[PDB]
Design a protein around this ligand. Structure first.
Ligand SMILES: COc1ccc(C[C@H]2NC[C@H](O)[C@H]2OC(C)=O)cc1
Ligand SMILES: [K+]
Ligand SMILES: [K+]
Ligand SMILES: [K+]
Ligand SMILES: [K+]
Ligand SMILES: [K+]
Ligand SMILES: [K+]
Ligand SMILES: [Mg+2]
Ligand SMILES: [Mg+2]
Ligand SMILES: [Mg+2]
Ligand SMILES: [Mg+2]
Ligand SMILES: [Mg+2]
Ligand SMILES: [Mg+2]
Ligand SMILES: [Mg+2]
Ligand SMILES: [Mg+2]
Ligand SMILES: [Mg+2]
Ligand SMILES: [Mg+2]
Ligand SMILES: [Mg+2]
Ligand SMILES: [Mg+2]
Ligand SMILES: [Mg+2]
Ligand SMILES: [Mg+2]
Ligand SMILES: [Mg+2]
Ligand SMILES: [Mg+2]
Ligand SMILES: [Mg+2]
Ligand SMILES: [Mg+2]
Ligand SMILES: [Mg+2]
Ligand SMILES: [Mg+2]
Ligand SMILES: [Mg+2]
Ligand SMILES: [Mg+2]
Ligand SMILES: [Mg+2]
Ligand SMILES: [Mg+2]
Ligand SMILES: [Mg+2]
Ligand SMILES: [Mg+2]
Ligand SMILES: [Mg+2]
Ligand SMILES: [Mg+2]
Ligand SMILES: [Mg+2]
Ligand SMILES: [Mg+2]
Ligand SMILES: [Mg+2]
Ligand SMILES: [Mg+2]
Ligand SMILES: [Mg+2]
Ligand SMILES: [Mg+2]
Ligand SMILES: [Mg+2]
Ligand SMILES: [Mg+2]
Ligand SMILES: [Mg+2]
Ligand SMILES: [Mg+2]
Ligand SMILES: [Mg+2]
Ligand SMILES: [Mg+2]
Ligand SMILES: [Mg+2]
Ligand SMILES: [Mg+2]
Ligand SMILES: [Mg+2]
Ligand SMILES: [Mg+2]
Ligand SMILES: [Mg+2]
Ligand SMILES: [Mg+2]
Ligand SMILES: [Mg+2]
Ligand SMILES: [Mg+2]
Ligand SMILES: [Mg+2]
Ligand SMILES: [Mg+2]
Ligand SMILES: [Mg+2]
Ligand SMILES: [Mg+2]
Ligand SMILES: [Mg+2]
Ligand SMILES: [Mg+2]
Ligand SMILES: [Mg+2]
Ligand SMILES: [Mg+2]
Ligand SMILES: [Mg+2]
Ligand SMILES: [Mg+2]
Ligand SMILES: [Mg+2]
Ligand SMILES: [Mg+2]
Ligand SMILES: [Mg+2]
Ligand SMILES: [Mg+2]
Ligand SMILES: [Mg+2]
Ligand SMILES: [Mg+2]
Ligand SMILES: [Mg+2]
Ligand SMILES: [Mg+2]
Ligand SMILES: [Mg+2]
Ligand SMILES: [Mg+2]
Ligand SMILES: [Mg+2]
Ligand SMILES: [Mg+2]
Ligand SMILES: [Mg+2]
Ligand SMILES: [Mg+2]
Ligand SMILES: [Mg+2]
Ligand SMILES: [Mg+2]
Ligand SMILES: [Mg+2]
Lengths: 402, 140
RNA sequence: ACGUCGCUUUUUGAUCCUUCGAUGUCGGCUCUUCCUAUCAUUGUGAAGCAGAAUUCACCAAGCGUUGGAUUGUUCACCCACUAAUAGGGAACGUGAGCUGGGUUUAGACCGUCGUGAGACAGGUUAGUUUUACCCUACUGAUGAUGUGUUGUUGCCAUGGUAAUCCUGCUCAGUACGAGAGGAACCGCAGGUUCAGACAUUUGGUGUAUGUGCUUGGCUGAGGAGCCAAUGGGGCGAAGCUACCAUCUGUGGGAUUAUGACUGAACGCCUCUAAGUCAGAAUCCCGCCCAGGCGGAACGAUACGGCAGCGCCGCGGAGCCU
RNA sequence: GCAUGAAGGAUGAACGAGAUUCCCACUGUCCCUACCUACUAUCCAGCGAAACCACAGCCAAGGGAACGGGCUUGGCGGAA
RNA sequence: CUCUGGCAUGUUGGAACAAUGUAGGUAAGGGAAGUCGGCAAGCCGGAUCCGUAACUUCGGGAUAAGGAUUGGCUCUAAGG
RNA sequence: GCGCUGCGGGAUGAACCGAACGCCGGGUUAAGGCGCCCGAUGCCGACGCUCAUCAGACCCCAGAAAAGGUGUUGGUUGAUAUAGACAGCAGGACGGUGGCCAUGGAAGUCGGAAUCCGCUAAGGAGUGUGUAACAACUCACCUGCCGAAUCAACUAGCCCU
RNA sequence: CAGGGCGAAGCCAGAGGAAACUCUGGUGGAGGUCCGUAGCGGUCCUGACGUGCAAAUCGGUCGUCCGACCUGGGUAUAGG
């Protein structure tokens, strides 16, 4: 008989199976559609989730109760040191899909990128690309590479650059670089190859891929939770306390007929560590990395036009379980998938941004830098000393010194 | 936006944590002679299976007077929550909460049955109901 | 209306074919899926449709259909909210899922009946709810399986699929209407219900057994500690986590109903016959999740042993299959 | 008054692990679920049963003793 | 909790800290809206001083209900 | 007849259709079939009927009725027509009389019965709209333009609702 | 068969009264008395277990706990 009262189903069947992701790095399942009219440009970038703080900004939203009023908005800090282009890959449109036509790598490959090719770098001889690189010097190789570039020019319709992160600039134990293919949109295919050939072995900053006030998508692997019951995995109603045999369950996993458990019924298993693609994450700030100017170190990337404090995006005491953000970063509104230190794929929007929220221009007024390793009380090292004054350790240090 | 009548505001109330589910007995903060309001239903709630309708400041509810003047008892009144003890986040990041849960008896037009309000009235409630804000002593 | 033709198995009967070396009985609860004879929501046609509201009908099951008082209740009835609070199936779906209120063993009470033992679709009270480690199904987990080995980067066959409804503002107190009343599209700000995250912030947790306080005892005492199955309590990092905080949720195509164009059949007419157009919460795809006993491109390919290997010389024979 | 009623009728203070209704206080009973601890479960070394068992084990429809794992016609089927 | 006396954790040990359990605990705001039913849990709790209703077989009800106080230290007075 | 019975066909099936059975070869059939599964039409098969945005498709047998269609195909009974039909484009549609009764109103047109006559090409005791009644429009009937077939009812095949 | 609560009769003193008697304080220590151990029992979680530690057990919570109390041994009653 019919269920007495109507109720929505628990969970979405569009995210099945709820299995551990086959990949750790976020995968761009679809790149933005190519408009040859647009200038040649990359469509994606790789970043690392450092942590989250909150900001203060004035909202220009006519007709809203927060119009010309200041609000506090949580933001996520994604460390994005420049990526190095080490290869070009061409694709041909076939009646069976897109087929990898030809791959051409640059002459010089860093040990960061070369680590990606080895399960045990320590025990290896690091021979990868040692014979390939000679093609760029030998006369026979130079002609062969030029044949590849011309064939890619003549037959490929999709051109992508193979780029890798610089793990040496990040405060992580990992030194193996995450490599990914980034599609090159805009222009003709000939212009795509000319543009990509120049960028070979070069660095690409994040501000050449993304801009301020841009709605972008974040692709990555959610935080793993291990083996979970239906109550946590699918958020099914807990059974009464009197329930024998346990209550963190689903009572009826199906009718008598059909005589099989259906795929739509909530079951226990893996939760988290699922590949996901969240969209419309607005870029609030593209921060600059630490810079050395005429002898001194410039690190006031957390200063706004209204808070001229010389402080970095790093909270007092550093980002918890991540480290110190010294490279370029992107400040994204709201939260994103993944743990701290998780590599995130930043992709341009597949949609046309015309809503007022998407077209909003963000002007920051304050960036919170209080410690997140407890109840943060002071924005900077300086004002903590100014407020508290000298301590016992300070007296002893000045006593020992003089 | 549960409020359903002409005379509303271009700006719309943002979502607030609701701490007062049906069954909540809240104080009556006006001079009608009622001492408390017993919620029986929140206006605008569609809800789901098993979820008790719940209200926050600014929410019109239907309530019965459990103790107070006898002619106010044994009948259903439209009431508006003006104070709640559940802390709720404003858009400027302030987690505000009051000492008590309080309401005032009104009619369907939003006009207030009493004449004075004891204690402060939340800013969210005051903006949504002009008549209540008019009788308020302080707006928190 | 008088008549009359049907459909359904959501009632009850009729029957007794299956089950008595046993298919666990009512109801609820939980959960999934399905049907449409559509309550709402999308697109429409008709009115005794001025507007608003309402009624009838079509495409239509994508999505939603709630919180309680009494009752074991299915069913009822009322309170209240709502866009609406539609109707049904799945062994009267769902007891090694639960619960056990009812029914339906043994105790007992009352009324009626009986000489009695006892009986009672009359009422009442108390009354053990067993087993999965097997196969499959399902959920996750490893692995097998192309390509010599191995790795990196990818493609997409196919399977899944998701968003929903409301309110206020503007339009506008306008069209319409004598008046009362009273719309709509575009635009704007939000919210419900769902989905997928996340922990900066607020809240929850807390055996960092972190740091104070404290009872009884114990180490002669101070100091430092310990025991009391976490002694108790305050505050509490990290981590986890809550519409109890916060973020994000999307574009095409052919078309249905219908309304039409050109236009015969039928010198007229006609949306249809040939031809053509507009067209929607449906459908299909995209986005998104997985990734074939399915492919692709690219890298490196085994040494002091005289070893392992590749390629050529359509080099020489012979072998097994 | 279906079918109350007098050795049992009617009533009782006190008592009750007796049946019922309401109110206060109280709470995770619930909204709505989260986290923590112990012991398991989990993996390992040693040790090591039982129930049960025609043969077995993927479905849809069909027909059939009128609800099939096997039969028919399709969907399909890949070690451990 | 300790001494005398006794014992080696109740027929095993190691590693880990998933789900579901069994046992214990806490939970914002609400407060029985859960459920057949407040089942379970929670609230209360000792002592001192106050204050104690209906009813009653005058014995009770009664720790009714309700309220305050409570440590440490230094003293004062009293009771042989 | 099944039970007691296999075998060919009916996909499948106790009963249906053919046919009943020692172990085989050749030949031929029955019922039933011959696009492919799957033996056989791989015939230059014959004559039609039918288009389905739920087509239809073989005894038992495994889905449907009343009712309807200006789909189409036949067939039946009438009617008009080269003295001019049907369609279309235009004019007349008159007098008695506002026929009788009835009705407050009833003048063709609320109702019941009569439903006749000079006047022509025709005009009614009216097929409808319309009015309190009128009026008015309009229909049959008939004429101008036109130049070959056309109109009405019914019936039953497939298809559709 | 811990430790506590309530405080029957009897008794003492004081006060009032013409008397009958009354009032107040104390003493006393009764009861199939109350709270609650050991013991005895077995309410509820319809908790654990439910091929169990166990062919009825375990945990929390409970009933009673000077009496119609609990209990050893001896003895009597024997299948319609
Ligand atoms: C009146 O309601 C009921 C009457 C009988 C039964 C049991 C029977 N049903 C089918 C079987 O014959 C038998 O199942 C068993 C296990 O004995 C159940 C409910
Ligand atoms: K049901
Ligand atoms: K509701
Ligand atoms: K039976
Ligand atoms: K502590
Ligand atoms: K009792
Ligand atoms: K209750
Ligand atoms: Mg339903
Ligand atoms: Mg793709
Ligand atoms: Mg139970
Ligand atoms: Mg922190
Ligand atoms: Mg419920
Ligand atoms: Mg503040
Ligand atoms: Mg009838
Ligand atoms: Mg039967
Ligand atoms: Mg059985
Ligand atoms: Mg059986
Ligand atoms: Mg069974
Ligand atoms: Mg129920
Ligand atoms: Mg329909
Ligand atoms: Mg559906
Ligand atoms: Mg009930
Ligand atoms: Mg059933
Ligand atoms: Mg059942
Ligand atoms: Mg059972
Ligand atoms: Mg079952
Ligand atoms: Mg029972
Ligand atoms: Mg009985
Ligand atoms: Mg009985
Ligand atoms: Mg009976
Ligand atoms: Mg009973
Ligand atoms: Mg009992
Ligand atoms: Mg199990
Ligand atoms: Mg196991
Ligand atoms: Mg915390
Ligand atoms: Mg000390
Ligand atoms: Mg010790
Ligand atoms: Mg705390
Ligand atoms: Mg939330
Ligand atoms: Mg279209
Ligand atoms: Mg036309
Ligand atoms: Mg059409
Ligand atoms: Mg079109
Ligand atoms: Mg009698
Ligand atoms: Mg009697
Ligand atoms: Mg008596
Ligand atoms: Mg089947
Ligand atoms: Mg059946
Ligand atoms: Mg079987
Ligand atoms: Mg067979
Ligand atoms: Mg132990
Ligand atoms: Mg041991
Ligand atoms: Mg032992
Ligand atoms: Mg705590
Ligand atoms: Mg709480
Ligand atoms: Mg609280
Ligand atoms: Mg309360
Ligand atoms: Mg209830
Ligand atoms: Mg209920
Ligand atoms: Mg209890
Ligand atoms: Mg009492
Ligand atoms: Mg026989
Ligand atoms: Mg015979
Ligand atoms: Mg035969
Ligand atoms: Mg046969
Ligand atoms: Mg057949
Ligand atoms: Mg032969
Ligand atoms: Mg034949
Ligand atoms: Mg055949
Ligand atoms: Mg053949
Ligand atoms: Mg016909
Ligand atoms: Mg048909
Ligand atoms: Mg003693
Ligand atoms: Mg005494
Ligand atoms: Mg006693
Ligand atoms: Mg006692
Ligand atoms: Mg005992
Ligand atoms: Mg039990
Ligand atoms: Mg068990
Ligand atoms: Mg004895
Ligand atoms: Mg004795
Ligand atoms: Mg005998």
């Amino acid at each position: 008989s019919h269920r007495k009262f109507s109720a929505p189903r628990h969970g979405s069947l569009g995210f099945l199976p709820r299995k551990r992701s086959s990949r750790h790095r976020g995968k761009v399942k679809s790149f933005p559609k190519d408009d040859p009219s647009k200038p040649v440009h990359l469509t994606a970038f790789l970043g690392y989730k450092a942590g989250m703080t909150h900001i203060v900004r004035e909202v220009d939203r006519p007709g809203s109760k927060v119009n010309k009023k200041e609000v506090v908005e949580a933001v996520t800090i994604v460390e994005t040191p420049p990526m190095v282009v080490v290869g070009i890959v061409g694709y041909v449109e076939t009646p069976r899909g897109l087929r990898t036509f030809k791959t051409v790598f640059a002459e010089h490959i860093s040990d960061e990128c070369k680590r990606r090719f080895y399960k045990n770098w320590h025990k290896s001889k690091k021979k990868a690309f040692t014979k390939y690189c000679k093609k760029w010097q030998d006369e026979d190789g130079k002609k062969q590479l030029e044949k590849d570039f011309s064939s890619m020019k003549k037959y490929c319709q999709v051109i992508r650059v193979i780029a890798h992160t610089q793990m040496r600039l990040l405060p992580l134990r990992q030194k193996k670089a995450h490599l990914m293919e980034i599609q090159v949109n805009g222009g003709t295919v000939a212009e795509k190859l000319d543009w990509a050939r120049e960028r070979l072995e070069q660095q690409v900053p994040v501000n050449q891929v993304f801009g301020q006030d841009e709605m972008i998508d974040v692709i990555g692997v959610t935080k793993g939770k291990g083996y979970k019951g239906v109550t946590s995995r699918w958020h099914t109603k807990k059974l009464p306390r009197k329930t024998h045999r346990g209550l963190r369950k689903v009572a009826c996993i199906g009718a008598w007929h059909p005589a099989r458990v259906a795929f739509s019924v909530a079951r226990a298993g893996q939760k988290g560590y699922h590949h996901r693609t969240e969209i419309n994450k607005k870029i609030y700030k593209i921060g600059q990395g630490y810079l050395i100017k005429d002898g001194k170190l410039i690190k006031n990337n957390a200063s706004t036009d209204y808070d001229l404090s010389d402080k970095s995006i790093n909270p007092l005491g550093g980002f918890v379980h991540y480290g110190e953000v010294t490279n370029d970063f992107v400040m994204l509104k709201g939260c994103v998938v993944g743990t701290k230190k998780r590599v995130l794929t930043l992709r341009k929007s597949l949609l046309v941004q015309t809503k007022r929220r998407a077209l909003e221009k963000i002007d920051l007024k304050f960036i919170d830098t209080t410690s997140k390793f407890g109840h943060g009380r002071f924005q900077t090292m300086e004002e903590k000393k100014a407020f508290m004054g000298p301590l016992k350790k300070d007296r002893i240090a000045k006593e020992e010194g003089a | 936006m549960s409020k359903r009548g002409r005379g509303g505001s271009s700006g719309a109330k943002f979502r607030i944590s609701l701490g007062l589910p049906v069954g909540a007995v809240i104080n009556c903060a006006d001079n009608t002679g009622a001492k408390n309001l017993y919620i029986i239903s929140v206006k605008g709630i569609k809800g789901r299976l098993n979820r008790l309708p719940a209200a926050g400041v600014g929410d019109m509810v239907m309530a019965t007077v459990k103790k107070g003047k006898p002619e106010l008892r044994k009948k259903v009144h439209p009431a508006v929550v003006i104070r709640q003890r559940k802390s709720y986040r404003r858009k400027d990041g302030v987690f505000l909460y009051f000492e008590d849960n309080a309401g005032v008896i009104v009619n369907n037009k939003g006009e207030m049955k009493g004449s004075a309000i004891t204690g402060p009235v939340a800013k969210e409630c005051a903006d949504l109901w002009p008549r209540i804000a008019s009788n308020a002593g302080s707006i928190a």
